[PDB]
Each structure stands twice: as structure tokens, then as C-alpha cells.
């Protein structure tokens, strides 16, 4: 029993973290086979700092301008190239600790673990969801750029996120590992801001099922609702629409607890309209939306890597 | 910016996790140098199951009754002994991945990471506090016994917890790595139950400081209180007393934010008496008590391992 925000074990990713330095700028890189991936802003100078041309900045660089350290070992850079907003530093040694890996781009509402790192050294690990507005609510201090987000499936690490910056509301933005930003964000100085966000309805339902599996039942009721009457209430409370595909994805949890998805939707409608009246669900006084249906199933069934 | 419940990177502990089997009972062990540590209940039979004598059960065992697997490699058991409620299985191979480590016993109100494991394989990592009643609120399914809790300081792993069982309220109990239970719990069948618990006041204050460091200030006020008037209110709301030593420990956070500890105590008194009036602090509608002052400082300053 119990339900916790749980990250993936981080070892396979720890063995890939290196430090990348250009001039006085130091950040983290991801060392896989003989390539080190890092945010391209590591090549920024003090000359523009506003709208600089990265292609110009990179033409002016040489391999020996990039200092890459893996623990105490300096790695020799033997090529460099740009990949959208990430840099690819070819080094002369393949990382002997390279796991099985894939680069995947995730969807809003999906979750992943973040290994927060400073100076190539891991400091902590936690779970993030990609918000509907393509930001993440992380914990990142100066120096943490280049930290990555990932999921692990058996022995395969799917890298989905590299950290690039903090927006003015204190939330975080970054790219997939092909260097393409999540959301309408750029690695140049602008007044860019997080757009309006919404609550991930299918995840809130998944978390109510987790609560039932763990013995919290007080919010259950004898009612069922239709998908459209539910979605009318959802819209009113800034929740995303619930699709039939979401209902299908919740199938396994509905089956394990014998509570129909539309039946649970009636419970969510009541919680949205009336609040919790001083009660809590899985130790929270708010409705939690950062657990996917798969996150619930994996934690209630016991899958390992 | 941002504040997240963050676990330690788990790699150093992943490389110590093995599977221990006796008969049909399989659980996890911790392989350090040439010793595997695991809960002694792995030797339980179906014969008593109530109040069995572990010393008798262990005399009846032979080394070859213990099957220890490290990944795909079987480890040869060459001695066995009892250490309070843990078993020490001497094996013929030292673990080449043994980190620098210490066995430390922690205090109620201190936090640690848990690497949840099944069949010797890590499945997830999360942060726990040791509650005042010596339970922890974890996420553990059948098979997870022998999972460990730890902190990491530079390159040193301090192991503080091994998981033994779930109590009837769904919270978890276990031992230090010398095999001594936290709290008044036993590894035999009884009606034992978690005693009454209280909220860890110094941690709630630490978390209010974290909130201020991250820009949540709405609960601040111009008042200060005395330590005794604060502790009168604390007692009334089932909070632990705040000592002068707690005030001293909060010194660094008080200094960074320029808000005196007694000044912050006035804020906590108001929150306890009036609630949050629909607001949140660091994304919570409840007062959070599972972050120590050190946890806040480490996450706001950026220490790594
Ligand atoms: C190099 S100086 N680029 C100009 C601004 O750089 C950044 C903008 C936003 C995030 C990170 C770097
Ligand atoms: C990640 S280490 N972020 C710290 C500051 O980001 C910038 C890096 C380079 C130019 C501008 C901003
Ligand atoms: C999961 S990430 N699988 C993708 C690549 O799988 C392998 C990689 C290297 C060796 C064998 C399989
Ligand atoms: C062996 S059968 N011991 C009797 C009861 O065993 C346990 C009691 C509580 C937790 C774990 C094992
Ligand atoms: C940890 S794997 N717990 C599962 C059940 O615990 C027991 C083990 C042996 C005897 C009694 C209970
Ligand atoms: C931190 S856990 N230190 C305790 C033991 O330190 C060492 C262990 C092994 C080799 C060197 C130092």
C-alpha cells in the first residue's frame, strides 16, 4: 500500500552526465556513445545576449574551445555541430556506461523523471509532468541546464527532455533531445511567458482510482454522468476535455476497482462543484493531476527495471 | 527556482541490490563488500507464522538454503548469522560496486530516500520522513521487503532504513541496518498498530522559508511571537514543541530571507488558527512537514554528490 510520487531509479542516467564548459559558461551534457549533447546556449557570449546568431557563434568556435569533463577525466572533442537548439560534441571515447536508449518526444500530460545536475554531478531526482502549456514545474538553479528528463522501460532509457531555461513565473522550459523546444519558447532573450494552463483531467481520474486502490473512498457516490455533461463541468473549471480514448485508457483501473469511468467522473464533478469539505485524498487537499494512468498501474502492480 | 520533493540519485544503491530466496519466500537484500543484509523474516515457514523463534529457525538452516542472485549471477553463501532483526549472509564475492558507506540510525523528523525494489530490481525512488511515531508513509507492495532508505553526502551513502512490513493503517515500519526496529514494532504477528502521530513543526517552518525563497509571501505578517506562546498554539494543534535548538537550526534560512524564526512562527500560528482561505503555498493546500531545514538549504543552494 501507499502512493507516492516516485521517480525512476537514476543510475543509468547518472553514468551519462558530464560537464561542458565554453569560456566562463559551464553546464551539463549527456554523454551517449561518442557524442555529448548539451544546450546550444553554452556558446553564448556577452556581445549580443539578446538576439544572437547561433550559426555565427558556432562557426567561430573550434573543437578545443569545448572542455568536456566526465568525472575527473577530460574528454577530447573531435567534432561539433548544431542540432536545432542542442549541440552535438563528438568526442574520441564512447561512454562505456551508455545504456540502451531512445530519444522520444512526449505529449502534454505525460510524466517523466528529471535528474537535476550541477557541474556534471547529479544532485537529485524527481517526477515532472509536461503541462498542457508545454512547461514543467521543476526545481532548477543556475547551472542546471543540460539536465535531462527520461522514462525507463525494462532496460531502455527513453530521453524526452533537456533543460534550457526558467520562465518569469518560475516554471521551466526545454527541448526534446533532437533540440526542438516543447512549446512556443526560444533560447534568446524575449519577454516570452508561459501561456495559460489547464488541469489534466485524465490524470486526476487516474489519481482518484489510485486513492480507491489505497482505501480512500469517501468521495465515491451512486451517480454516473454522461461524457458530455462531465465535459461541460470540466470546461467550466479549466479542466481539459475527457475523450473516449481517455476512458479507454482508464479501462484497467476501472476494472481493478469495479468503478466505471463515468461513475468516477460523477465523483470528480462533485469534488469540483463542492470541494473536499475539509477532507483529503491520498494526503492532498487538492486534486492532483501529475500521475498518468500508467503511473498508477505501475505503482499499484510493482513493475521493475 | 522551484521546490520539489527530491530524492538522492539512486545509482550507488542500485548497484547493491540483490534478490534473496529461502524456500518459496523471495525478498531483497543489500550487498555490501562480502555480506548480504536482509530482513530475517525471509526464514519464516508456514509452521508457526504467529510467534516463531527465529533463533530456532536459523539453527535449522544451512548456507545452501539461501539463494542469492545479483542480476543473473548466483552468489555463493558461505556463512549466515543473525543481527537483531536482520540476517547477515556472508558470500564468497565482494560487491565490486560497493560505495563508501556508513550505517546510521536516524531521528524522527529526519528524511531519507527509499529505493523501492522487487526481486532484487529497483523500481522507483522517493523521499520519506521518519514520523514522530517511528513509521514512514511509503509505497511498498508485497515483495518490497529489504528495500533500503539512505542519504548521500558527497560520495558517502549513509544507510538508515531497511523495510520489514506494513502496519494496518497502511504505513510502513522497519529497522536500521543493525537490525533494530524504529519504534515499538516487532517482526511477529501481533495486533501492533502505529501510535498517535504529530506534525514536525521545525520542518513546517523550514518549508515556509522555502516558500519565501521561491516567492510565496502572502502568509507573512508584521507580528512576532514568543517561543512559549507559539508552543501553546502548537500543542493545541498536535504540533511538536519548537525548541531553541530548532530555532538555531533555522538560522541560515532566517538569514537568507531576513525573516526571524519567531517572526515566521507568528505566520504559522495564523495559518493554524485561520487556515489558508483558499490559497496555496508551494502548490499545497496543506502545511507540509516532510522537508528538513537541510533539505531546503540543499535544494535552494545546489549541493551535488
Ligand atoms: C546567448 S547570449 N543567447 C541569448 C539569450 O540566451 C538565452 C535565452 C533564454 C534562455 C537561455 C539562454
Ligand atoms: C542554465 S545553466 N541557465 C543559467 C543561465 O542561462 C543562460 C546561459 C547562457 C546565456 C544566457 C542565459
Ligand atoms: C530500448 S531503449 N531499446 C532501443 C535500443 O535497444 C538496444 C540498444 C543497444 C543494444 C541492444 C538493444
Ligand atoms: C515468521 S512467520 N514470523 C511471524 C510473523 O512474521 C512477520 C510479522 C510481521 C512482519 C513481517 C513478518
Ligand atoms: C515483504 S516482502 N513482505 C511481504 C509479506 O511479509 C511477510 C514475510 C514472511 C512472513 C510473514 C510476512
Ligand atoms: C562516508 S560513507 N565515509 C565512510 C567510509 O569512507 C571511505 C570508505 C571506503 C574508502 C574510503 C573512504
CB contact under 8 A, A285 and B284: yes
Q: Which three cell numbers stand for residue B171?
A: 504505513
Q: Tell me the CATH number for domain A201-301.
A: 1.10.1840.10
Q: Whose CA is nearest to atom 5 of ligand 6?
A: B100
Q: Count the Cβ atoms, other than its own, within 10 Å of residue A75.
A: 22
Give whole-number Cα distances, A4 to A1, A55, A238, in Å. Answer: 10, 45, 26
Give the integer Cα–Cα distance in Å for A204 and A289.
Answer: 5
Decide: A107 and A130 in contact? Cβ < 8 Å.
Answer: yes
Q: Which of B127, B60, B171 is nearest to B295 (CA)?
A: B127
Give the integer Cα–Cα distance in Å for A203 and A10.
Answer: 24
Give the integer Cα–Cα distance in Å for A43 and A266.
Answer: 53
Q: Whose CA is nearest to atom 12 of ligand 6?
A: B100
Give whole-number Cα distances, B130 to A27, B84, B291, in Å. Answer: 35, 20, 11
Class in CATH terms, B11-91: mainly beta
Size of chain B, expressed as the number of residues it contains: 305
Q: What is the DSSP letter of A63?
A: G
Size of chain A, expressed as the number of residues it contains: 305
Q: Give the active site residue among B44, B145, B265, B300.
A: B145
Decide: B227 and B262 in contact? Cβ < 8 Å.
Answer: yes
Give the integer Cα–Cα distance in Å for A221 and A44.
Answer: 58
Q: Give the distance, in angstroms, between the CA of residue A11 and the centroid of all CA atoms in the same chain.
A: 18
Q: Count the Cβ atoms, other than its own, within 10 Å of residue B186.
A: 13
User: What does residue B274 show for φ and ψ, rounded to 5 degrees?
Assistant: -115, -15
Give whole-number Cα distances, A216 to A1, A232, A278, B52, in Å. Answer: 12, 26, 14, 34
Contacts of A80 by beta carbon, 8 Å cutoff, 6+ apart? A58, A61, A63, A66, A87, A88, A89, A90
Q: What is the DSSP letter of A134?
A: S
Decide: B135 and B171 in contact? Cβ < 8 Å.
Answer: yes
Active site residue B41: yes
Give the integer Cα–Cα distance in Å for A267 and B63.
Answer: 55
Helix (H, G, I), strand (E, B) or coil at B63: helix
Q: Is A98 left (phi over 0), alpha (psi -120 to 50) or beta?
A: beta
Q: Is the CB of A143 under 6 A from ligand 2?
A: yes
Q: Give the distance, in angstroms, between the CA of residue A184 and the centroid of all CA atoms in the same chain.
A: 16
Domains A11-91 and A201-301 share a fold: no
User: What does residue B39 show for φ and ψ, rounded to 5 degrees?
Assistant: -65, 140
Active site residue A265: no
Q: Whose CA is nearest to atom 11 of ligand 3?
A: A100
Q: Give the active site residue among A22, A38, A41, A160.
A: A41
Helix (H, G, I), strand (E, B) or coil at A39: strand
Question: Resolution of this PDB entry, in A?
Answer: 1.6
Q: Which of A159, A160, A163 is nearest to A145 (CA)?
A: A163
Partners of B223 in the β-ladder: none
CB contact under 8 A, B1 and A303: no
Helix (H, G, I), strand (E, B) or coil at B304: coil
* B283, closest residue in chain A (CA to CA): A286
B256 touches chain A (CB under 8 A): no
Q: Which three cell numbers stand for residue A176?
A: 526534446
B198 CA distance to ligand 4 middle (Å): 28
Chain B residues with CB inside 8 Å of A141's CB?
1, 300-302
Q: Is the CB of B33 under 6 A from ligand 6?
A: no
Which residue stretches of B9-149 are H helix? 11-14, 54-59
Angle at A271 between CA A270 and CA A276, to 5 degrees: 130
Angle at A139 between CA A135 and CA A142, to 5 degrees: 100
Give the integer Cα–Cα distance in Å for A186 and B50.
Answer: 64
Q: Which of B69, B14, B63 is nearest to B43 (CA)?
A: B63
Q: Which three cell numbers stand for residue A41?
A: 546556449
Amino acid at each position: 500500500s501507499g502512493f507516492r510520487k516516485m521517480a525512476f531509479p537514476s543510475g543509468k542516467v547518472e553514468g551519462c552526465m558530464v560537464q561542458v564548459t565554453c569560456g566562463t559558461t559551464t553546464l551539463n551534457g549527456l554523454w551517449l556513445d561518442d557524442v555529448v549533447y548539451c544546450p546550444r546556449h553554452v556558446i553564448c557570449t556577452s556581445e549580443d545576449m539578446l538576439n544572437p546568431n547561433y550559426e555565427d557563434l558556432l562557426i567561430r568556435k573550434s573543437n578545443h574551445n569545448f572542455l568536456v569533463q566526465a568525472g575527473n577525466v577530460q574528454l577530447r572533442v573531435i567534432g561539433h555541430s548544431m542540432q536545432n537548439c542542442v549541440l552535438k560534441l563528438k568526442v574520441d571515447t564512447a561512454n562505456p556506461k551508455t545504456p540502451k536508449y531512445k530519444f522520444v518526444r512526449i505529449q502534454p500530460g505525460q510524466t517523466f523523471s528529471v535528474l537535476a545536475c550541477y557541474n556534471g554531478s547529479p544532485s537529485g531526482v524527481y517526477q515532472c509532468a509536461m503541462r498542457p502549456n508545454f512547461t514543467i514545474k521543476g526545481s532548477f538553479l543556475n547551472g542546471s541546464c543540460g539536465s535531462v528528463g527520461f522514462n525507463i522501460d525494462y532496460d531502455c532509457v527513453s530521453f524526452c527532455y533537456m533543460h534550457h531555461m526558467e520562465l518569469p513565473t518560475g516554471v521551466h522550459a526545454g527541448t526534446d533531445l533532437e533540440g526542438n523546444f516543447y512549446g512556443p519558447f526560444v533560447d534568446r532573450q524575449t519577454a516570452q511567458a508561459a501561456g495559460t494552463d489547464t488541469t489534466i483531467t485524465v490524470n486526476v481520474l487516474a489519481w482518484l482510482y489510485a486513492a480507491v486502490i489505497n482505501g480512500d473512498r469517501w468521495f465515491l457516490n451512486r451517480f454516473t454522468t454522461t461524457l458530455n455533461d462531465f465535459n461541460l463541468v470540466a470546461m467550466k473549471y479549466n479542466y481539459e476535455p475527457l475523450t473516449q480514448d481517455h476512458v479507454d485508457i482508464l479501462g484497467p483501473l476501472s476494472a481493478q476497482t469495479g468503478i466505471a469511468v463515468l461513475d468516477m467522473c460523477a465523483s470528480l464533478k462533485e469534488l469540483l462543484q463542492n470541494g473536499m469539505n475539509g477532507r483529503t485524498i491520498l494526503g492532498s487537499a487538492l486534486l492532483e493531476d501529475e500521475f498518468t494512468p500508467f503511473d498508477v498501474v505501475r505503482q499499484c502492480s510493482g513493475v521493475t527495471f
